[PDB]
Amino acid sequence: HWGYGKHNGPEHWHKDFPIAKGERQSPVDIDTHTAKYDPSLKPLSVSYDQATSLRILNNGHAFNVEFDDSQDKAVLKGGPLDGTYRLIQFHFHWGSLDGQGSEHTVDKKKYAAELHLVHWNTKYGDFGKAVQQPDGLAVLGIFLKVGSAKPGLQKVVDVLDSIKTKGKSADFTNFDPRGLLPESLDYWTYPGSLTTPPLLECVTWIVLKEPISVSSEQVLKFRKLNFNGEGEPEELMVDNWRPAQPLKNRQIKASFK
Numbered sequence: 636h637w638g639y640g641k642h643n644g645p646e647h648w649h650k651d652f653p654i655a656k657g658e659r660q661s662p663v664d665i666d667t668h669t670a671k672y673d674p675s676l677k678p679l680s681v682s683y684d685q686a687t688s689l690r691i692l693n694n695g696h697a698f699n700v701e702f703d704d705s706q707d708k709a710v711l712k713g714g715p716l717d718g719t720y721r722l723i724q725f726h727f728h729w730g731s732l733d734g735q736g737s738e739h740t741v742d743k744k745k746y747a748a749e750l751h752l753v754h755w756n757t758k759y760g761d762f763g764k765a766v767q768q769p770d771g772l773a774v775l776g777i778f779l780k781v782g783s784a785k786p787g788l789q790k791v792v793d794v795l796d797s798i799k800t801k802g803k804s805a806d807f808t809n810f811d812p813r814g815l816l817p818e819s820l821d822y823w824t825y826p827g828s829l830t831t832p833p834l835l836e837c838v839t840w841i842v843l844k845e846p847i848s849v850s851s852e853q854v855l856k857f858r859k860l861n862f863n864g865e866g867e868p869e870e871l872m873v874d875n876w877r878p879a880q881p882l883k884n885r886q887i888k889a890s891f892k
C-alpha cells in the first residue's frame with residue numbers, strides 16, 4: 636500500500652490514484668513575488684473557543700488530534716471561504732532533518748514541519764460528502780521552524796509515547812488548538828487537493844505566512860514515532876511529506892501587501 640518509502644512513495648501514488656497528476660494538486664511552491672494581493676479577500680475568522688478535542692491517533696502516516704465535529708464548535712470562516720467549515724482534526728508533516736519536512740514551500744524554502752488544521756463545509760452535512768466537492772474542505776496550513784519551544788504544543792509531544800505505532804490511540808480531551816497559532820493571520824490561498832491518497836481535489840488551501848517556532852526537542856519527539864504497527868520492525872515516522880506539485884492553471888492570492 637501507499638506510503639513514503641522508495642517503493643511506495645509519492646512518485647508511485649499515481650498508479651493507484653491517477654488524480655495524482657491532476658489539475659489542482661497540492662502541495663505547491665508559493666512564489667511570493669508572483670502571488671497577487673487580493674484586496675477583496677476578507678480577514679480569516681478562526682473561532683476555536685468552544686473546540687472539543689477527543690482523541691489522538693497514529694494512523695501509520697501521521698498522527699491526528701480529532702475533534703467533535705457534530706456541532707459548530709470550532710469553525711473557520713471568512714477569508715476566501717463561503718459558509719462555515721468545522722474543524723475535524725489536525726496533524727503534521729515533518730522531516731528527518733530540520734531543513735525539510737513541510738509540504739508547501741515558500742520561494743523553494745522547506746520548513747522543518749507543517750501543521751494542517753482540517754475543516755469541512757457544513758453545507759455538505761458530513762466529511763465524506765464534503766471530500767466529493769470542489770469546495771468541500773478548508774485546510775489551514777502553518778509552517779514550523781526550529782528555535783524556541785511552542786508551549787501550546789507540549790501536551791501533544793508528551794502523549795506521543797503512548798501512540799508510538801500504527802493503530803494506537805489515546806484519549807486527548809481538553810486540548811486548545813489556539814495555542815498552535817502564530818500572531819498574524821496573514822495568508823496565501825489557492826484551490827488544491829488532499830496531499831495524501833486519495834488526493835481528492837476538494838480543498839481550499841489557506842497557508843499562513845508567519846511560521847510558529849518549536850524546539851529541537853519537540854520535533855525530535857515527532858521523529859520517534861513509528862510508521863509500523865506494534866510487533867513489526869521499527870520504521871521511524873519521518874519524511875511523511877509530499878513534494879511540491881505543478882501549479883498549472885492556478886493563481887495564488889495573498890491576503891496582505
Ligand SMILES: N#CCCN(CCc1ccccc1)CC(=O)N(CCc1ccccc1)CCc1ccc(S(N)(=O)=O)cc1
Nearest residue numbers: 751752753761762763764766774828829830831832833838
Ligand atoms: N476508517 C477510516 C478512515 C477513513 N477516513 C474518513 C472517516 C469518515 C469521517 C466522516 C465521514 C465519513 C468518513 C478517511 C479520511 O480521513 N480521508 C480520506 C478521504 C475520505 C474522507 C471521507 C470519507 C472517505 C474517504 C482524509 C484523509 C486526509 C488526507 C490528507 C489531508 S491533508 N494532508 O491534505 O490535510 C487531510 C485528510
Ligand SMILES: [Zn+2]
Nearest residue numbers: 726728751830
Ligand atoms: Zn496534511
